[PDB]
Enzyme design. Structure first.
Site: not given
Ligand SMILES: N=C(N)Nc1cccc([C@H](OP(=O)(O)[C@@H](NC(=O)OCc2ccccc2)C2CCCCC2)C(=O)O)c1
Ligand SMILES: [Zn+2]
Length: 304
Positions: A64, A67, A122, A139, A192, A266
């Site tokens: 992303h 990040e 993103r 993702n 991430h 994270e």
């Molecule tokens: N298979 C998975 N989904 N694994 C997974 C596990 C944990 C986190 C994540 C990822 O989270 P991320 O992108 O690192 C990131 N998420 C993010 O930016 O979300 C944005 C968003 C925006 C609009 C709607 C929904 C989500 C963090 C998550 C925890 C709070 C702070 C931001 C993801 O959304 O892909 C994936």
């Molecule tokens: Zn991410």
């Protein structure tokens, strides 16, 4: 000019992958596993003492674009491996017995964009028919319960799951590589930010892994090692309920490919700076994250 204590743009990072490879030809080889929507080369570094049929660990950063501490860490890791080889016992054992596949930046086009236009971007930067909305979410684009929950079918949304699983040249390239190296890759780690967590499957549904206890124990011990430096508190658990339901992630997919150890990291912080983690926290973040990565690595050594 490259620095491990500051955020580098893609030109600097690209130049670094070439430079760090040439200076450590004994520990690092470099390939490109494909190209991005815009034609940029997705570079992969293989770190290790070459040998017959070595098992591997695969780690990627920069899924992303916004990040940045993610991209910063894959670079920090690579320097740690090559500087401390031979001098720190554990990394010496690590590189002799296995290979680390480090993919410094998956989403290169998006990352360029956060430098040039929108620091909070993103998604990828591919086009979508019928709309001016740009980008798929890397993702949500893997073939794991694809687009069934936590993902949008609207191209304008931040979690747009794409036109089909692996519609993105980038996710296709990564899946293709993993799928062709299944016999050697024993762990999958994807980096991430932010939140200070270690997550394991699943997120595309609320079932837990077949080795649930094992991954829970492993995460718990990893966050313990990480705390030892500055007292930074990480939590851990399955993605679906520790963060939110979200199908089409690479951690779930890698796991369902049969990679038994599959974690989403994270990193810092908890939101005080969020994605815009100041450069003055890079080193301390990276140092503590190394202890978690190395602990997991040593454990995986038990299963080769
Ligand atoms: N298979 C998975 N989904 N694994 C997974 C596990 C944990 C986190 C994540 C990822 O989270 P991320 O992108 O690192 C990131 N998420 C993010 O930016 O979300 C944005 C968003 C925006 C609009 C709607 C929904 C989500 C963090 C998550 C925890 C709070 C702070 C931001 C993801 O959304 O892909 C994936
Ligand atoms: Zn991410």
């Amino acid at each position: 000019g490259h620095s491990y204590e500051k955020y580098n743009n893609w030109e600097t990072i690209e130049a670094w992958t070439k430079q760090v490879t040439s200076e450590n030809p004994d520990l690092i080889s470099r390939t490109a596993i494909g190209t991005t929507f815009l034609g940029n080369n997705i570079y992969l570094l293989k770190v290790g003492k070459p040998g017959p049929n070595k098992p591997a660990i695969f780690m990627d950063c920069g899924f992303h674009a916004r990040e940045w501490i993610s991209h910063a860490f894959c670079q920090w890791f690579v320097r740690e491996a090559v500087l401390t080889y031979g001098y720190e016992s554990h990394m010496t054992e690590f590189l002799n017995k296995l290979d680390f596949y480090v993919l410094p930046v998956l989403n290169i086009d998006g990352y360029i964009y956060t430098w040039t236009k929108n620091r909070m971007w993103r998604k990828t930067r591919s086009t979508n028919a019928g709309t001016t909305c740009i980008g798929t979410d890397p993702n949500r684009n893997f073939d794991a319960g694809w687009c069934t929950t936590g993902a949008s079918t609207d191209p304008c949304d931040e979690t747009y799951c794409g036109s089909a699983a692996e519609s993105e040249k980038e996710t296709k390239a990564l899946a293709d590589f993993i799928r062709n190296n299944l016999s050697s890759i024993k762990a999958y780690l994807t980096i991430h930010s932010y939140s200070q967590m270690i997550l394991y499957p699943y997120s595309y549904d609320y079932k837990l892994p077949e080795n649930n206890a094992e991954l829970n124990n492993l995460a718990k011990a990893a966050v313990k090692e990480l705390a030892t430096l500055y007292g930074t508190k990480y939590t851990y658990g399955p993605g679906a309920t520790t963060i939110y339901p979200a199908a089409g992630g690479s951690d779930d997919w890698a796991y369902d490919q049969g990679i038994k150890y599959s974690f989403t990291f994270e990193l810092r912080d908890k939101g005080r700076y969020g994605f815009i983690l100041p450069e003055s926290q890079i080193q301390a973040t990276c140092e503590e994250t190394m202890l978690a990565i190395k602990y997991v690595t040593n454990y995986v050594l038990g299963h080769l």
